[PDB]
Design a protein around this ligand. Structure first.
Ligand SMILES: [Zn+2]
Lengths: 49, 98, 128, 878, 49
């Protein structure tokens, strides 16, 4: 599951956890490789900065 | 059907014999708005003032603003709502599942 | 002060495995609406438009026409999915045509001149 | 680039026009993928230079069209001009002089005439207009343009069709006022008779002229006149704006309430067309639910947006409004194969372009590696690559009711054949493996009677009479009144007489594929046109299993592989002991048994495909179709419920009329028949493989996205409301001029007309059709299959019957449409103000009246009229 | 489609109306339908055709 909400009015954008949580772009994450592969261009413009 | 009705006037006129042949049966003189509106009154002619029942929300002192009397007589001064919308195109970000 | 933030750079690495140019050219003709069927219905004057033909002969003619259209769309000479000369005795098949009107009569003569004859049978002229 | 939808925007000073689509302030669809840089957009069909675009071929109707200008249809014209010497000429500034303007014509006689939209700024006009000359000129053009194509006098109007003209005029009058009142800029005033009221200002350079026409209380009371002692009677504060929204976008208020000139009739019509378009909106959250559900879980979509209230996007109708559009589209066909050829043709193309299945016929040649063995290589012809029959056979499962698929007579044996010939045995093998894939309701009876026809003379089975001999061709067992008792009950075939025939009937009754059903689309937001069928099911004549690619090719749980194995075993038992084939000089039993064992044990991923990935692709394709699927239930072998006849009913239920069967009932089968090729279906079944590297989550995620990028569902759902809404305005308007039992309330009867027959009613209904098409800007079909014969109809319905006479009536109720009851409201408005539309009631009196009294013959005194009550009056009739 | 039969109040001649009515009644007794044609040709075929 990958649902990404954009951050309106200075708030940070969030991504959906496996257990239904919405987390900002911090901390330690764990991906499977196929999750990056299916969404490589959409993840490059969000995460590489 | 050809009719032949006279002309209203604001001063007194000279009477003249006029013969007419085709009349109606009931009151069909509703489309007439007003006669000689610039004048103070109408001495000779079919007299008819401004139809006050059509301008209901002005001349009625105890009337709600947004009312109607619709099936009987249409009102020519009402309360209209004006909008300004947008119709955005169908946008979707299509993501893949592993 | 944007110095071209490091998220994006394009080179067209992935190519489509079914192919966008192959799937889209079939979706362009799946998008097409159903062909109109107009014959049997009246125009502004009142005449039922279409051709004058036996209805079953016409319903066999469109089986011929759609078989030839199938043979042309499959890029060959003889059709394989044929719509005529099948196994089924479809002998009561009727289609719409301009032979009958909306009332149930014939259209050997148009309605716009049937009504003209019916009214022109009564005139009245001035005396001499 | 946009940090919301991840779209790359060249020349970054113009992404405001892109982010306006996300609701972020300063054409049709904009889809972007997430794994590649290929965004796909759509555009309308009338435009030119489609560079990186594609069309929307469906006729979307123009629902939302805005309108500035004042909203009325009744204007006031002068008739006889005059001028008076007035006392006040201008106004008092220090050095300026402002003129005196008046809201009304200042003439001697002025009266109200009708012009629809005489002051309006329109972005797309509904090409319809009630334009009336002032009544001193001619006015007979508005009561002649319908049902007077012949007339003895072109300067006249038929007395027998006044109602047929007035109803069409009122339909025009409602049907060209379907606009939305657009907000515009204001301006503050400090005129001494309007203090501080923020008055409306029209668009255009000459904007401030309209204030006298709009606002009658703007001028004061300069002198003594009939206008001035009226302005002296009106109140003052009720002018200009009245209310505004709390929300804004910067400085503009969102919605406003303004006091101005209008008419109650047009504002009442537009205030409910407003609610009609406001009922249909949908947020993008339900769209990202809908496409996720319709993609069958292989693709997750998302659609981000900003919080807004004023967003409008009408795309939501009901199942009841969808099913009637489906019934009109079914009546469109009318038994010609031209209107159903390109549908099935391009669905057969699209399945080939999406499907992973690569059908090459070389697997058969590599297995044979070449006599009975070379004879089947002669019969199958693997040098051919034409496989349209198999894809059309798959595309025909979505249409059980309008079209049916059989096997052509070329695929059958020659004179029925006999088992003594080898070529007829291979004919039987090619036939029996291709028969289960067709929508023929009697495939097993043909599968039995082919072998019973080939076994004539060596063993016999009983039949019901002398007439229908066992040696009857299997082509002609086409309808369930021909199913023999020997097939209906197995126990009548003794194993002593016909052992191989009892084995064949046993194999048919046990191991024939049973029907199943699968869920597609979404019924919550898109609805479903599932007539005769529950709202989320897709009936299939094959069993389906969940999809994996690692299943073995030689499982006999798969019922198609089981079917191929049982047919090969039956033919092995048929060949095994050299009876049934006398005169074969050599011993061909070993070679024939070996070439049957190879065909039983061939590897082929087509039966693996048809139960796992073909229903998934059908469920993905099906809700995006322009003609959504119309199915009638599949039964395996249950004779008592087999459909034979599908018809459409125009009339009501409580009436009894002439039996007007629809044209679609005239088929021998249930629909229009088409013949397939058992050769190509058999070789496509026996061969075919996947690519050696596929992952389904790559292949289908790459095949779904360009297909959904050219969607048209949001235009079809926006057209089905118009198709549903034309039906009420047909059935209500034709019931006024004709006679039916459908009760609608008789809103005008004093206008004379005739009891119209079917031709007159069809001519009237054609104008009712073409006015709505002209206004809503359509080109394709609308409402016209109802025009062909008996347009005096009440209520749409559709039925089908089983074998035993059990019928199923599906009557979709319709919700109340808006054009219907607004026309039937303005008829009741016309009943009280008939004079404004140029019509008078009552009657006339011809006779010499000579006097100097002036009394205006529109209003007679009672001293010289008479009636039937008046004594001494003779009455003449006929 | 074409309706089957209608009744009109036209001018006529009640003798020749009776003649043509009895001629129609003669031709209506001679009437076979395609099902009986199919059965007759099948039984005449001795089941071969
Ligand atoms: Zn964007």
């Amino acid at each position: 599951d990958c649902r990404i909400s954009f951050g309106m009015n200075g708030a940070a954008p969030m991504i959906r956890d496996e257990t239904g949580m919405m987390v900002p772009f911090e901390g330690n994450w764990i991906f499977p490789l196929a999750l990056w592969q299916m969404n490589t261009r959409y993840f490059n413009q969000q995460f590489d900065a | 059907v050809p009719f032949m009705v006279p002309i209203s006037s604001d001063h007194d006129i000279s009477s003249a014999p006029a013969v007419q042949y085709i009349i109606s049966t009931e009151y069909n003189d509703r489309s007439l708005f007003c006669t000689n509106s610039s004048s103070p009154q109408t001495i000779a002619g079919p007299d008819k003032h401004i139809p006050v029942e059509r301008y209901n929300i002005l001349t009625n002192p105890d009337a709600p603003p947004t009312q109607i009397q619709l099936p009987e007589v249409v009102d020519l001064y009402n309360v209209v709502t004006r909008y300004a919308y947008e119709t955005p195109p169908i946008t979707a970000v299509v993501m893949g599942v592993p | 002060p944007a110095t071209a933030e490091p998220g994006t750079s394009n080179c067209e690495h992935y190519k489509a495995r079914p192919g966008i140019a192959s799937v889209q050219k079939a979706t362009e003709s799946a998008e097409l609406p159903m062909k109109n069927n107009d014959e049997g219905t009246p125009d502004k004057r009142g005449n039922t438009k279409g051709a004058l033909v036996n209805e079953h002969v016409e319903a066999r003619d469109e089986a011929d026409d759609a078989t030839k259209k199938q043979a042309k769309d499959t890029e060959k000479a003889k059709a394989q999915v044929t719509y005529s000369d099948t196994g089924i005795n479809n002998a009561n098949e009727l289609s719409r045509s301009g032979n009958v009107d909306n009332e149930g009569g014939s259209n050997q003569k148009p309605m716009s001149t049937r009504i003209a004859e019916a009214t022109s049978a009564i005139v009245s002229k001035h005396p001499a | 680039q946009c940090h919301v939808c991840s779209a790359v925007l060249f020349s970054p000073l113009d992404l405001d026009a892109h982010v306006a689509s996300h609701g972020l302030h300063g054409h049709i669809t904009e889809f972007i993928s997430s794994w590649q840089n290929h965004p796909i957009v759509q555009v309308s069909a009338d435009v030119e230079n489609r560079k990186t675009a594609q069309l929307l071929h469906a006729d979307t109707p123009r629902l939302v069209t805005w309108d500035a200008g004042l909203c009325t249809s009744f204007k006031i014209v002068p008739i006889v001009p005059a001028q008076v010497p007035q006392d006040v000429l201008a106004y008092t500034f220090f050095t300026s002089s402002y003129a005196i303007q008046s809201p009304f014509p200042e003439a001697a006689v002025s009266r109200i005439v009708v012009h629809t939209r005489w002051a309006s700024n329109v972005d797309f006009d509904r090409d319809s207009s009630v334009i009336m000359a002032p009544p001193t000129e001619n006015n007979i053009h508005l009561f002649k343009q319908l049902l007077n194509t012949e007339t003895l006098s072109v300067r006249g109007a038929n007395p027998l069709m006044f109602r047929a003209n007035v109803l069409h005029m009122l339909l025009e009058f409602v049907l060209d006022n379907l606009y939305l009142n657009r907000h515009t800029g204001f301006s503050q005033d400090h005129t001494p008779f309007t203090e501080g009221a923020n008055l409306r200002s029209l668009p255009g350079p000459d904007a401030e002229k309209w204030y006298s026409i709009m606002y009658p209380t703007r001028m004061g009371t300069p002198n003594v006149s009939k206008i001035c002692n009226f302005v002296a009677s009106c109140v003052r504060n009720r002018v200009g704006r009245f209310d505004r929204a709390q929300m804004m976008n910067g400085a503009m208020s969102e919605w406003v309430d303004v006091f101005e000139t209008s008419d109650a009739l047009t504002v009442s019509i537009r205030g409910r067309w407003m609610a009609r378009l406001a009922r249909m909106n949908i947020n993008p959250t339900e769209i990202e639910w809908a496409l996720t559900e319709c993609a069958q879980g292989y693709v997750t979509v998302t659609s981000p947006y900003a919080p807004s209230v004023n967003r409008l996007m009408p795309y939501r109708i009901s199942n009841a409004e969808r099913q009637i559009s489906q019934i009109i589209r079914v009546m469109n066909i009318g038994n010609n194969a031209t209107v159903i050829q390109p549908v099935l043709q391009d669905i057969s193309v699209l399945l080939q372009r999406i499907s992973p299945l690569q059908i090459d016929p070389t697997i058969i040649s590599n297995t044979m590696s070449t006599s009975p063995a070379s004879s089947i290589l002669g019969k199958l012809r693997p040098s051919n690559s034409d496989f349209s029959s198999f894809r059309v056979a798959l595309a025909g499962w979505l249409y059980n009711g309008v079209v049916t698929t059989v096997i052509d007579d070329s695929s059958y044996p020659k004179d029925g054949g006999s088992v003594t010939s080898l070529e007829n045995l291979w004919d039987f093998f090619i036939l029996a493996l291709a028969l289960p894939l067709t929508t023929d309701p009697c495939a097993p009876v043909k599968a039995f009677m082919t072998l019973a026809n080939m076994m004539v003379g060596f063993e016999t089975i009983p039949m019901d009479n002398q007439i229908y001999t066992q040696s009857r061709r299997a082509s002609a067992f086409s309808t369930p009144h021909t199913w023999p008792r020997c097939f209906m009950n197995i126990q009548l075939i003794s194993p002593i007489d016909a052992p191989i025939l009892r084995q064949w009937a046993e194999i048919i009754h046990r191991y024939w594929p049973n029907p199943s059903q699968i869920r597609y689309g979404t019924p919550n937001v898109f609805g479903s046109a599932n007539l005769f069928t529950p709202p989320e099911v897709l009936l299939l004549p094959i069993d389906h299993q969940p999809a994996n690619v690692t299943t073995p090719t030689l499982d006999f749980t798969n019922e198609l592989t089981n079917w191929r194995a049982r047919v090969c075993e039956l033919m092995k038992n048929l060949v095994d002991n050299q009876r049934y084939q006398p005169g074969w000089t050599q011993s061909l039993v070993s070679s024939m048994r070996g070439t049957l064992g190879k065909l039983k044990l061939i590897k082929s991923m087509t039966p693996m495909y048809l139960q796992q990935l073909a229903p998934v692709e059908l469920a993905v394709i099906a809700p995006m179709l322009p003609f959504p699927p119309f199915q009638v239930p599949y039964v395996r072998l249950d004779r008592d419920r087999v459909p034979t006849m599908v018809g459409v009913t125009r009339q009501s239920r409580d009436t009894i009329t002439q039996p007007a069967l629809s044209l679609s009932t005239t088929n021998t089968t249930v629909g229009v028949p088409l013949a397939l090729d058992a050769r190509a279906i058999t070789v496509a079944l026996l061969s075919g493989k996947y690519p050696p590297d596929l992952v389904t989550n790559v292949w289908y995620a790459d095949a779904i996205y360009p297909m959904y990028a050219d969607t048209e569902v949001f235009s079809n759902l926006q057209r089905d409301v118009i198709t549903c809404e034309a039906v009420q305005t047909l059935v209500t308007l034709v019931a006024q001029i004709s006679e039916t039992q459908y009760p609608v309330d008789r809103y005008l009867d004093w206008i004379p007309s005739l009891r119209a027959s079917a031709a007159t009613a069809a001519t009237f209904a054609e104008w009712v059709n073409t006015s709505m098409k002209t206004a809503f800007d359509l080109s394709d079909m609308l409402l016209e299959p109802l025009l062909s014969g008996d347009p005096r109809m009440t209520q749409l319905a559709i039925q089908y019957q089983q074998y035993n006479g059990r019928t199923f009536n599906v009557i979709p109720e319709m919700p109340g449409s808006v054009i219907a009851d607004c026309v039937q409201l303005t008829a009741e408005v016309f009943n009280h103000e008939y004079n404004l539309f140029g019509i008078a009631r009552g009657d006339i009196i011809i006779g010499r009246v000579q006097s100097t009294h002036l009394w205006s013959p529109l209003a007679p005194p009672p001293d010289l009229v008479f009636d039937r009550d008046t004594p001494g009056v003779h009455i003449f009739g006929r």
